Amino acid sequence: GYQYQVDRYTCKTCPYDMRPTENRTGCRPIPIIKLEWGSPWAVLPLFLAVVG
Amino acid sequence: FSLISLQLLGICVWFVVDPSHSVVDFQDQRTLDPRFARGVLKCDISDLSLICLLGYSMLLMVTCTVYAIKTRGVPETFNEAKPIGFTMYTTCIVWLAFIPIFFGTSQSADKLYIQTTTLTVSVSLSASVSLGMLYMPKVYIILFHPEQNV
Amino acid sequence: LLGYSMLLMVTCTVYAIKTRGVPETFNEAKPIGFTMYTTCIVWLAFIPIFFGTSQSADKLYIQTTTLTVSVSLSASVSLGMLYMPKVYIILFH
Ligand SMILES: O=C(Nc1cccc(Cl)c1)c1ccccn1
C-alpha cells in the first residue's frame, strides 16, 4: 500500500507527501491543520487562557 | 531587563543557527498501510530548545526559592516568602507533570494534539497559580475587606 | 490503592480545613495544612499524567515511574514542611 499502480506493468512509489487514492491509479495529498479552532482537545487551553 | 537580555541573546543565537523552518512536511508519522489518515502540521520549535528554556526557568526558580528562604525574617507586611516558595514548588510540580506526557508520546498518534496542548496547559497553569496565589489575596484584602488597606 | 490513598488524604485535608483557625499553641497545624495543600496540588497534577500517558510508545516505563515520583513528592512535602523548620530550630540551639 505504500505504492500506487501508475501502470499495469508494476506499481510505482508515490512521493513523500501524497498517499495512494482509494481506487489506485495515482495519489493525491490531503492537507491537515493544527486542530484549527475546533472543539476537540482545544477547549481546556482556551478556557485556561481566557479566564486567566 | 538585563536578566531578560541574558536569555534574549541565546534566543537570537538559536534563531540564527536554527531558523524557524516551519515545514509543513511533517510526514514522519505515516499510517500508509491503511492509507486512511496521515500527515501532520507543526512548528520547528525543538525539544532541545524547550528543554533549554525550561532549564533556565528552573534555575531562576531555584534562585527565587533560595532568596525566598533567605528573606523569611521580614515581618508580615512584606512577608512575601511563603507564597513565593509555594509558587516555586507549584510551578516545579506543574513542569514535572508536563515532562512525562510531553516526552513520552513520541511514537504514538496525536503527537501534535498531545505535546502542544500539554505544554500550553502547563504554561497556563503555572501562570494562573503565580498570578492568583500571588496577588488575589492582596486584591481580596483591598476590595473585599476595606479595613486593612491603611 | 490510589483511591484509598486519596480517600485518607481527603479526610486528612478536610480535618485540616477545620484545623485552620486554632491558636498558636498548636505548632504543627499550619505546617500540616500547608503539607495537605501541597499534596493536593501534587495529586491533582498526577491525574493528567495518568489519563494522558495512556496509549503511547512507552505505556509501562512511564506509568510505573510517574506514580513513583508522585509518592516521592508526597513524602518530600511532608518531610520538608514538618522537619526542616525543626532542623533549623535545632541548629539555632
Ligand atoms: O511525573 C511526574 N514527574 C516526573 C518528571 C520527569 C520524569 C518522571 Cl519519571 C516523572 C510528576 C510530577 C508531579 C506530580 C506527579 N507526577
Q: For chain B, what is the HEC assignment?
A: CHHHHHHHHHHHHHHHHCCCCCCCCCCCCECCCCCCCECCCCCCCCHHHHHHHHHHHHHHHHHHHHHHHHCCCCCCCCCCCHHHHHHHHHHHHHHHHHHHHHHHCCCCCCHHHHHHHHHHHHHHHHHHHHHHHHHHHHHHHHHCCCCCCC
Resolution of this model in Å is: 3.4
Closest among A45, C41, C56 to B100, alpha carbons compared: C56
Distance between CA atoms of residues C57 and B100, nearest Å: 12
Q: Are A4 and A27 in contact (CB under 8 A)?
A: yes
Distance between CA atoms of residues C30 and C53, nearest Å: 35
Decide the pairing of beta strands A19-20 and A27-28: antiparallel
Of all helices (H) and strands (E), which one includes residue A46? helix A43-50
* Residues 6+ positions from B14 with CB-CB distance below 8 Å: B49, B52
Say how many Å lie between the CA of residue C85 and the centre of ligand 1.
26
Say how many Å lie between the CA of residue C17 and the centre of ligand 1.
27
The single-letter DSSP state of residue C53 is S
C38–B94 CB contact, under 8 Å: no
- Three-state SS at A13: strand
Instruction: Give B62-66's long-range contacts (Cβ < 8 A, gap of 24+).
Output: B64/B88, B65/B89
Distance between CA atoms of residues C65 and C71, nearest Å: 10
Closest among B59, B67, B97 to B84, alpha carbons compared: B67
The single-letter DSSP state of residue C92 is H
Q: Are B22 and B44 in contact (CB under 8 A)?
A: yes
Distance between CA atoms of residues B127 and B122, nearest Å: 9
CB of B97 closer than 6 angstroms to any ligand 1 atom:
yes
CB of C22 closer than 6 angstroms to any ligand 1 atom:
no
Q: Are C70 and B96 in contact (CB under 8 A)?
A: no
Residue that is written with C-alpha cell 491543520 in the block = A33
**Beta carbons within 10 angstroms of residue A20's beta carbon:** 21
Q: Which residues of B touch A42 (CB under 8 A)?
A: 117
Distance between CA atoms of residues A24 and A6, nearest Å: 8
The single-letter DSSP state of residue C62 is T
Distance between CA atoms of residues C52 and C72, nearest Å: 20
Instruction: List A27's β-bridge partners, or say none.
Output: A20
Q: Are B125 and B94 in contact (CB under 8 A)?
A: yes
Distance between CA atoms of residues C44 and B129, nearest Å: 13
* Residues 6+ positions from A51 with CB-CB distance below 8 Å: none
Q: Are B93 and C45 in contact (CB under 8 A)?
A: yes
Grid cell in block for residue C69? 515520583
Distance between CA atoms of residues C30 and B86, nearest Å: 14
Q: Which residues of B touch C37 (CB under 8 A)?
A: 86
State how far the alpha carbon of A36 is from the alpha carbons of A17, A33, A42, B95, C69, in Å: 20, 6, 9, 26, 35
Q: Which residues of A touch B23 (CB under 8 A)?
A: none
Distance between CA atoms of residues B22 and B28, nearest Å: 14
Q: How was this model experimentally determined? A: cryo-EM
**Beta carbons within 10 angstroms of residue A14's beta carbon:** 20
